Structure 1
Amino acid sequence: RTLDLPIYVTRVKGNNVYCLDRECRPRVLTIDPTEFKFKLALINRKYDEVLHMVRNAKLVGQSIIAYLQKKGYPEVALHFVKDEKTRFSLALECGNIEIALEAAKALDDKNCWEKLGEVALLQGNHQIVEMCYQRTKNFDK
Structure 2
Amino acid sequence: RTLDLPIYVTRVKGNNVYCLDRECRPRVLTIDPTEFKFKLALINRKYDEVLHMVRNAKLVGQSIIAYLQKKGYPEVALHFVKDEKTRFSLALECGNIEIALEAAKALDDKNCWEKLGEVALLQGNHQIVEMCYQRTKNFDK
TM-score bracket for this pair, using the shorter chain length: 0.5 to 0.7
Return closer, same or farther for 1:14/1:108 CA change in 2, 3 Å cut-off: same
CA contact (8 A) 1:19 1:28 kept: yes
Return closer, same or farther for 1:36/1:71 CA change in 2, 3 Å cut-off: closer
CA contact (8 A) 2:6 2:21 kept: yes
What secondary structure, in the 3-state scheme, does the structure 2 residue paired with 1:31 have? Answer: coil
CA contact (8 A) 1:70 1:77 kept: no
What is aligned with 1:126? 126
Cα deviation for residue 120 of structure 1 reads 3.8
What secondary structure, in the 3-state scheme, does the structure 2 residue paired with 1:37 have? Answer: helix
Cα deviation for residue 16 of structure 1 reads 3.2
Return closer, same or farther for 1:62/1:51 CA change in 2, 3 Å cut-off: farther
Cα deviation for residue 126 of structure 1 reads 3.9
Cα deviation for residue 133 of structure 1 reads 1.6
Cα deviation for residue 125 of structure 1 reads 5.0
Q: Which structure: greater strand fraction?
A: 1
CA contact (8 A) 2:84 2:107 kept: yes
What per-residue deviation string (whole Å, max 9, x for no partner) do you get for residues 109-138 of structure 1?
222332222124435654423311221223
Cα deviation for residue 104 of structure 1 reads 1.4
What secondary structure, in the 3-state scheme, does the structure 2 residue paired with 1:18 have? Answer: strand
Aligned length: 141
TM-score where L is the length of structure 2: 0.56
Return closer, same or farther for 1:15/1:136 CA change in 2, 3 Å cut-off: same
Cα deviation for residue 105 of structure 1 reads 1.6
Partners in 1 of 2:23 and 2:8 — Cα distance?
11
CA root-mean-square deviation: 4.8
Moved more, 80-89 or 127-136: 80-89
What per-residue deviation string (whole Å, max 9, x for no partner) do you get for residues 84-104 of structure 1?
357657777898967633221
Return closer, same or farther for 1:59/1:71 CA change in 2, 3 Å cut-off: closer
What secondary structure, in the 3-state scheme, does the structure 2 residue paired with 1:64 have? Answer: coil
Return closer, same or farther for 1:12/1:93 CA change in 2, 3 Å cut-off: closer
Name the % identity. 100
Return closer, same or farther for 1:41/1:29 CA change in 2, 3 Å cut-off: same
What per-residue deviation string (whole Å, max 9, x for no partner) do you get for residues 56-95 of structure 1?
7999696589975754875545666655357657777898
Partners in 1 of 2:63 and 2:125 — Cα distance?
35
